[PDB]
Amino acid sequence: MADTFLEHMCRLDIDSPPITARNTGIICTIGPASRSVETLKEMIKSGMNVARLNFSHGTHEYHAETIKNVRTATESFASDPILYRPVAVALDTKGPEIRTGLIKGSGTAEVELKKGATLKITLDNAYMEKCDENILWLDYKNICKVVEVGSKIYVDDGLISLQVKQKGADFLVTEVENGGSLGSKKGVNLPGAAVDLPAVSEKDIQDLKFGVEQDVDMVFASFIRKASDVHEVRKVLGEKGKNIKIISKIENHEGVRRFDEILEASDGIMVARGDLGIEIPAEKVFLAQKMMIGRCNRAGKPVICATQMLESMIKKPRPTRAEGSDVANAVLDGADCIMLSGETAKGDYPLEAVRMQHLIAREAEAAIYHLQLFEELRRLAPITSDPTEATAVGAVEASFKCCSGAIIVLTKSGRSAHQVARYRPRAPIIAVTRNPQTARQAHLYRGIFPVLCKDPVQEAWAEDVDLRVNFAMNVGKARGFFKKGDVVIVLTGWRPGSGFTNTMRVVPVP
Amino acid sequence: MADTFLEHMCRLDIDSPPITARNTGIICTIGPASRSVETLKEMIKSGMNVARLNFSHGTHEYHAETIKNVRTATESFASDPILYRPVAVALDTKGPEIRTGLIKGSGTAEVELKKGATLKITLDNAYMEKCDENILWLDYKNICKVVEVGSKIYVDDGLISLQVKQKGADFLVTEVENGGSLGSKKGVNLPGAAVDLPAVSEKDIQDLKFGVEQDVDMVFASFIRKASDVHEVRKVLGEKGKNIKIISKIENHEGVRRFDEILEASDGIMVARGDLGIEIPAEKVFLAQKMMIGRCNRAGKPVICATQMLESMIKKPRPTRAEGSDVANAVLDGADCIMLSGETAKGDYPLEAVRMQHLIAREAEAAIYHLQLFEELRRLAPITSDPTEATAVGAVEASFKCCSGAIIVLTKSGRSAHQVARYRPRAPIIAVTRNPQTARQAHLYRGIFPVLCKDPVQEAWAEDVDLRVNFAMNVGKARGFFKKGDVVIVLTGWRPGSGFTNTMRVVPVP
Amino acid sequence: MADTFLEHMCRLDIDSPPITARNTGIICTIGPASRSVETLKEMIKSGMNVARLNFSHGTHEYHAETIKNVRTATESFASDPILYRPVAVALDTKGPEIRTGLIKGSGTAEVELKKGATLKITLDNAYMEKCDENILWLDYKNICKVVEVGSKIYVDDGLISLQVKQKGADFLVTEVENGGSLGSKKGVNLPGAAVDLPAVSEKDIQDLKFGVEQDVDMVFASFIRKASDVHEVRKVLGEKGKNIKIISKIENHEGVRRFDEILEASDGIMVARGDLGIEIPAEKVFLAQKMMIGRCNRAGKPVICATQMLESMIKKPRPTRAEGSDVANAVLDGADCIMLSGETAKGDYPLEAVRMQHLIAREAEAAIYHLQLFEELRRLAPITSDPTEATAVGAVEASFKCCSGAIIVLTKSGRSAHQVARYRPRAPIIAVTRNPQTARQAHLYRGIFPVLCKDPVQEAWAEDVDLRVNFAMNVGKARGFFKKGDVVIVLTGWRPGSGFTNTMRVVPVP
Amino acid sequence: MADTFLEHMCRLDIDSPPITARNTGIICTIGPASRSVETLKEMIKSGMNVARLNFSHGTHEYHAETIKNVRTATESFASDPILYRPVAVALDTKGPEIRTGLIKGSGTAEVELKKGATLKITLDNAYMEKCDENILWLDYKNICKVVEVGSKIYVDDGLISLQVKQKGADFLVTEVENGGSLGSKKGVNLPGAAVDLPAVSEKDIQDLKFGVEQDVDMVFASFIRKASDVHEVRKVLGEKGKNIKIISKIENHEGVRRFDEILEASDGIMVARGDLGIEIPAEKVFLAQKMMIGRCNRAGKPVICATQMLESMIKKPRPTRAEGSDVANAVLDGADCIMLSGETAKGDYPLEAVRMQHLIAREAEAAIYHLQLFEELRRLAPITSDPTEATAVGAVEASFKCCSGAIIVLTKSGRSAHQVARYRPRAPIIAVTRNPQTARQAHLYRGIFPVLCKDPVQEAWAEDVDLRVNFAMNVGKARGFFKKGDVVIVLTGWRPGSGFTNTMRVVPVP
Ligand SMILES: [K+]
Ligand SMILES: [K+]
Ligand SMILES: [K+]
Ligand SMILES: [K+]
Ligand SMILES: [Mg+2]
Ligand SMILES: [Mg+2]
Ligand SMILES: [Mg+2]
Ligand SMILES: [Mg+2]
């Protein structure tokens, strides 16, 4: 809108209402607070696009029923194919974690840790359910190999910290620095160590194969360190799960250093700030986020900002001021998807969290300085002569001039719609598809609003197109994206077949 | 290509050969040296696109035969509809000129004028063919009304200059400043004065009506001062000449000050540097040129740089260094058409002049900094939601990415093709049309390479399009614009009818 | 560093260590957890620059001793004038707050509020200490004037919310939306309403006059609605407190709408997100922040991002991921000062909070895209011919070319140094001053590192300058800003006197 | 001034009068029409800055007296040291030219050449003064070595052209293409050939040594092909002529290809369009000009646009429209100096040509888009930490903000002033110097207006500076550059000595 970024900031207006559409994808983690079919229905209406299953906790039976509930709540809306919203299922792997043992005692399963006190760490399975003030167990077998005297051991997602004083053959005497209440099977981080667990562990092969059987849409592979880790996960999914999108989670120092080879192998990225903020200094996480989002935008691949975006909303019904700014800034940085972990999995206000996510994202979109964003994306794009790319850039450029309410894209594999999203247009991308997996996986991309055409293929191609285009027109009028008499962009082929979406059309809305 | 204009300059390369296509239109004035049918044939092959007829000199009989010869030489190539080049006819009006009388004496019709001597100017028709050292006649009746003591009177296109010492009721005693040889019926300019002749004079109404009868494509209306002058010319052309394009010539101070209202009324503009450089100081003409070309580019209307671009080539076979740089710079400024006046009308080297025009223009196109040109044209464009505009910008944006050999545009009125030219793409715009006037008038716009489809309308619309598109493909292969296997942009409608070219298509060349 | 903002993001590097200097000012609120002289000493070393006193709670006796402790801990370091860091005192006024009455009952002073229940609000002072489930008192007299049916009333800093169902003459029947435990004299916010309390209330006149007596450096005036509110505060401070800087806190909708007139009157701004996030929707606070920071940067006036930047660090020793990104982004937005409210006032980890503030800020500075920031600031600056401005821009431009370790500025009033900070140079601005208040107030400006020259004025001006310049050279070597042999910029006058710093000098470091 | 280059063009105004100062240097070639002391006086007042002596024609006696007259006419104004303008002398070498023999016959020394006829070229000195229709002599001995069948031979600066049909051992039979009148000792060009004459020929060593003896300021070395040619010329000038600036003339294809190594060795460049436009195609000369001017601006070295800029003004009192635009565009391209060859050397209107040069240049300066020019020059500058560079950029940046009437620079060698000119400020650079050669050589740089301080060195350095600064203030008021009360930039040292101009000062004009 304005000639400089500084004037663009100065022009930002609280009283200027945002567009009804919301481009940024929302990913909610399912758990105790959101597992029920009636709650899942409300989360879908509130704005959920992808349900994340965290395989660091549940059994296969538990997760199987969580999937069952999600599809019940999803297909609840299928009676009306206009207002039907696809909902993806995502399997977040355990990965090479270090979790502690269980706690001994009555009342509750917790014990205090004084600042300055001693705590012996052990690998002996006799203390596997007898962790307390003095002794502590953890499942990583080679912990004495990778650790030295003075090394930090962070327990329970950063809260508690320990410095190693002495070593044994298989035991470590440590001194407590940050106190607090220890619990059962809390996560442990070893910043400075080189943890040598397998990227695809024995448990993870079972969880992935289960993912293929359950027909999940994507896999959030944890603690990805290098490009070979992504190919290991690709192999385990194999032929049958070839179409399952692999999103590499960057959770550690090694993963940041090797980001380019990891991005090359992966379908997308998750900036998993949780583990990253322990493994790397807290100041710096933003550097890593902005870098990874930046490179993913340039590469044209989905990137997900994740964890602790609305942490206070576990306990409270409204977010903090910092949590408000974090979500907005992640969207302004250019993140395709925002994520909620504990907020929806085990929180007292799951629905309010999903709505805040929707609300902030929706006018972070408005505050994007599109003039500069689009200018720079063209320059930094390679000079390939793929007809689908050139149509996409034409569509996006066309959309900025005739302030379009939408860009409608007929697509089988999603790729035609992905390439439009790559250039970050202001208008939403109504991706029309008969492939239901394509509709679900499209949530990963910023601004793609998938719609599933359940209708049978009409005889003539020319009339089959017009049905899918008019189907999208009806969805756009229904959602408020545009009205009768407005202008929109339409992307179709020349005789059908996945591979050549080469036709842009500026159509008046009927 | 490069990140800054300065590096763009530094990168310019004499050894890098230019593209075979030449986007800038060439307008040649026809006269004694170029009137013959065999010479007109060679000028068309050398690169002529518009033939200009100067109605300050010829009779209606004379100009009628000049038109006849142009169409003979043009239709000479019509046997091959691939290599047929349309050629426009343009009628340049007399307008409110001030010409002197004839000269007395034997030997030749010329007399000397010393610096510092006296010259009496008279309106008495007894001296109408007796102009000499002492007395001089001129056809402007109210010359004593608009002139005062100290006013400059420039005779013979700037060469000779006079300062007014005394006044009479109908005579002026002047003193000579610049000497030289006076001649018969030379043009007179009155810088500082406000000449009150009619914009559409009595003679001009005859010449315009003749223009309509002869079926000319455009009118270069001389000495346009204000917007009402353009509407007077529009009226005289009337219903029958409604489709004749009016190009307002800016020849004077008043015309520059009122440029915006004149541009609004006119179809295009000519920066007539000849009279402008006398009426306004010589330094400043470039300011006026760059301004008018700039505003015309922003308005999306044709602009023509004109007169004295290769003056030395009247006498010599090669241009001066300044004349080389002038043509290049006019193209770099963003002029749609370059013009030759005396160079082709009465010169010893008409063909070499037209070829230089072609040669310079053709790699001025290459030196355009398109990165900046296209960026700035988008910003300065209004945010209209006309479907034809948004398709045009999409086409042009698409053309920069898949380095297209051309942008093919099916168009009846030319408007679909005009709107593509407005955003100055690098590739040539092959405008396919059945209307032969549309083909001729399209030369006014930068980069539009019109082709006339003489074939009858095929039955199905879908196959009628494919014939016109494949016709353009054959022209492009013939001219070297592109080859088999290359990519091009194609613009068509959705069911035929002039008003909605709304379909962009990235097609491989068959 | 890079040609585009997108490549600049992509280039950001966690492994690239930051510059030793930290440009962004840090403001800590003093209270129970940080009031002691030994804790204040550690906060100064950790990075405190301004001590904020919140006059909504303490008595004048209480705050007087807090000031006494701050100056004791500050002057503790005065023995070494090289490593002495000035520390400002700031008085944050009560302003037009709306607090409830006291609670009835034994044990503790609290009652529950169910979601959906009824609560009658009253102005009758008989219920002034009898607030409960049914009745609630509050000190705002005209609450029925500014409120209508459907208006929200937020109690206890956002936690509890009420919708107005009915109205009375002086009573309001409301329905509860967000439940929770009500308490004694909790703050109330009225989103939508136009609260007509006095901007400078009766209590505030006492607090301001006390501020003048105590010799505070700045006043954070709360709930500033319009420009006249700033002039009221200016008057109360009067002649004796003329040099006390007024920082208008934007806490409400009215204040955002009138931002430009408020900024014109005020010396600086605080984006008080606390009250702003209740008064305005939570999504939107970032819009208001970015706007106010943007306009303050363009105006060349201090702006302070404030409240809830590290809220979790009240309870925990490390911040959340969102809190890390919030501080970085506020610095990237261009905030001069970051602020801690509860984190230092009543938290379990005051020192760790001040260190995080220092750590994040310090490499947010590094991630600033200075190429674009400086380009845009020049364009958006007026074309004034003040000699001090032109020297400042020259200094800043010079600093980018000879990668200067610092820009040294001799200044009495601080204004010469303020104008250098206005153009946001990468290097720190070592402002040398004999006025001790100038040194303290300079913390408000980004990158000004004040140093107090306690030495007496040496006889010759030329040698007096060289003493102050060499004093700064010694501070710069001490702090690691630069070393012997490096280059720095130096700003001095031409014969001394506050008003003309007109001399830039590129000096090698001795 | 404006946000885009396109709006900048649109904003250009004929009625907006230009600044009184004229930044672009003017170089006039002296000959028959301008050799007299009274004419040289008028040319100096009209705007001459450098007198060029063409050593392809005169004897050493002839040129010695031309120099004598120039210094007489120059020192004529020395009585008033305020209005004294230094005037450089420049020696343009013969270089490896190919000139023909003399013509046989009475009446005049000319013969006709028909198109299509035969002309035998010979190296036999018996035909050295017997060139005619059939036989032609030329001084290049190895002409048969470097030429083949089909090679073009251009005679008399492009007018006449010949194609080689046959070869001999030492004779060539050719066919005429372009006719015209041949003359005595006309220049010959061999485009496509690799002419192997010495860069510093035997005659050139005499002319250079003479140049050193006469105390010329610069040498325009002709036909520079590579970097070694520049070092040969450097050697011949040697110790005694070490301070004589070498300006390499780019006249040929080889010189353009090797431009970077030539620029590295040379002090400046001349885009000698005369020979370049024959050696290289006429279309393309502009490419070569814009490239060379661009790279010279980036390198910070003088560049001179030359030959045929006002060719018609040899015969006529006013230039053509193309010649007007050429001078403006060369200045807009960024040429430091404009040059007149035949226009002043042997023309009927020398003074009018020098005035047009002055007039056009002077409001080409105004039409420069400085916003973009300065932005891009900073980015493309290396990040060196020379204190003189950083002061220069500071000065130039400061000058844009406080719309300075001038930037005053005290300089001995000129280098402090050269580095200010490198960043192309809008204001003129008043370079104050006691070295009279420094004053003369400073004309090579755009916008440096040298003034010679003839006064003796005053005792105190601080008062010696103030004398030179106040001397410049008086010159600026005299010329209209600024008035009493205005602001200007001043550049001085810290204790005198050539090597450290490190002090910028924004001074009010007394
Ligand atoms: K996990
Ligand atoms: K005419
Ligand atoms: K307060
Ligand atoms: K020469
Ligand atoms: Mg994580
Ligand atoms: Mg004309
Ligand atoms: Mg507050
Ligand atoms: Mg030459």
Author numbering:
A (entry chain C), B (entry chain B), C (entry chain D), D (entry chain A): 22 to 531
Cite, word for word, the article reporting this structure:
Pyruvate kinases (PYKs) catalyse the last step of the glycolytic pathway by transferring a phospho group from phosphoenolpyruvate (PEP) to ADP, thereby generating pyruvate and ATP. M1PYK is the constitutively active form of the enzyme and despite the high (96%) overall sequence identity, M2PYK has a low basal activity but is activated by the allosteric effector fructose 1,6-bisphosphate (FBP). Each subunit of this homotetramer consists of four domains: A, B, C, and N-terminal. The active site is formed by a pocket between the rigid body core and the flexible B-domain.
Histidine and serine were identified as activators (∼30% activation) for M2PYK. In contrast, serine activated M2PYK by increasing Vmax (from 106 up to 170 µmol/min mg). Chaneton et al. obtained an R-state M2PYK structure in complex with serine by soaking serine into an M2PYK/FBP crystal. FBP is a strong activator and locks M2PYK in the active R-state, and crystal soaking with serine leaves an open question as to whether the interactions made by serine are facilitated by the preformed FBP-bound R-state structure. Here, we co-crystallised serine with M2PYK in the absence of FBP and show that the serine interactions alone stabilise the R-state. The enhanced activity of the serine-bound structure can therefore be explained by the stabilisation of the R-state conformation in which Arg342 from an adjacent protomer primes a glycine-rich active-site helix and locks it in a conformation allowing substrate binding. The interactions made by serine in the amino-acid binding pocket help lock the R-state conformation which is stabilised by a well-defined arrangement of hydrogen bonds across the C–C and A–A interfaces. The X-ray structure of the M2PYK/Ser complex shows that the attractive pull of the N-terminal domain by the serine side chain shrinks the allosteric pocket and results in the formation of a hydrogen bond between Thr41 and Arg500. In this active-R-state conformation, both the C–C and A–A interfaces are zipped together by a total of 20 cross-interface hydrogen bonds.
